[PDB]
């Protein structure tokens, strides 16, 4: 007659942290993702927990186009 | 048959459908022209003039359009039509759903079922000249166990047959005993 189950985990708080059209530095996390919802393009590196970040600085761009997954492209400025 | 038409130029029409003037649109290959028809004329002819009959539509340009219905959107807690999609037929074997029916003793009338699966006789495409008004299906002896239709004896006179399937057709169900 008691409460069977009333606990819940603390949120790890994932999500897209840098959208496109944003000037970034070398090292900014583009997206905190649980699984690899985004695939690395140019100048994009993954880590341990599928987190991809920028290798250089510039204006970032998404969706080169599909059929393999969503793309992240850190494009440098010239 | 013999229904009037008008024009629409991107109006309000939720405010126009208060006096029994529901909107519409007709086409055969192009010219998606927005019209509105009258509700007691369209409803009164639409009492018996079903999908099989070619409802013709007088237009202020002087043309008589051989149309039919594509869908009647039910008002869904009011039981009314919002918008009816007309379909002009052209020189093309267009698609038709003909409400055929059943005549005869169903299953030996005392030991009879229901024969409720009408389902609008799934599809028959036709030229505009060989289009029918009524095709008859008999139910000569079809008692409870055997003798089902199975669309094998579904050869209509002429044009055309059912295209892909032969599976949806009426059958005999047992009654509700106490």
């Amino acid at each position: 007659g008691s409460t069977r189950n009333g606990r819940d985990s603390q949120a790890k708080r994932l999500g897209v942290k840098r959208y496109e059209g944003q000037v970034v530095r070398a090292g900014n996390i583009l997206v905190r993702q649980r699984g690899t919802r985004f695939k690395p393009g140019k100048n994009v590196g993954m880590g341990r927990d599928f987190t991809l970040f920028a290798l250089v600085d510039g204006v970032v761009e998404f969706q080169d186009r599909g059929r393999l997954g969503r793309y992240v492209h850190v494009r440098p400025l010239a | 048959y013999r229904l009037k038409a008008y024009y629409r130029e991107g109006e309000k029409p939720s405010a126009l459908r208060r006096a029994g003037k529901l909107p519409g649109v007709m086409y055969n290959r192009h010219l998606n022209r927005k019209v509105y028809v009258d509700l007691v004329e369209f409803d009164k002819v639409f009492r018996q003039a079903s999908i099989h009959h070619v409802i013709v539509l007088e237009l202020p340009d002087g043309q008589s359009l051989p149309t039919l219905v594509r869908q009647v959107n039910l008002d869904k807690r009011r039981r009314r039509p919002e918008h009816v999609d007309f379909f002009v037929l052209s020189d093309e074997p267009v698609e038709m759903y003909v409400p055929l029916r059943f005549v005869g003793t169903p299953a030996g009338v005392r030991a009879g079922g229901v024969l409720q699966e009408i389902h609008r006789d799934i599809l028959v495409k036709v030229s505009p000249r060989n289009i029918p008004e009524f095709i008859e299906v008999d139910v000569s002896g079809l008692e409870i166990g055997d003798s089902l239709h199975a669309s094998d004896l579904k050869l209509p006179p002429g044009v055309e047959l059912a295209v892909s399937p032969e599976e949806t057709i009426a059958a005999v169900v047992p009654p509700e005993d106490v």
């Binding site: - | 018996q48 869904k76 229901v114 009654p175 509700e176 005993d177």
Partner: protein, 141 residues
Amino acid sequence: MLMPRRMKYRKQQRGRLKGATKGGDYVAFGDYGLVALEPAWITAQQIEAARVAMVRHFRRGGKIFIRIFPDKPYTKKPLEVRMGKGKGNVEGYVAVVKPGRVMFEVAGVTEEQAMEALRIAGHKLPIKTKIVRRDAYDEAQ
């Protein structure tokens, strides 16, 4: 009564009752239909009480059609119990219905007998349920 034999989870929520119909206005099975007009719930006791009131009314012919299925567990706490301490027990599965949805559809019953039978089963439900016949208002092209 009747109940779903398998579920993913036992208890679930209530929600709201808005929306028009989400399907279920065209009859497509029988020649008549008992269509609802007010949003409420349909218990399995309301299903049984309306289903018995057909087969006991008309006999030897006419198949009855039901197009309602209870998948929502009505959750009620026991009597003289304070608030909290989890949800209550499950007593009977209810069925959410929307206005303008056709619930009961008679088959093989005539006009003056189907109006009467749907009139008898109309009083077994807490909803204003009017009666519609077979019209040309199908979804065919």
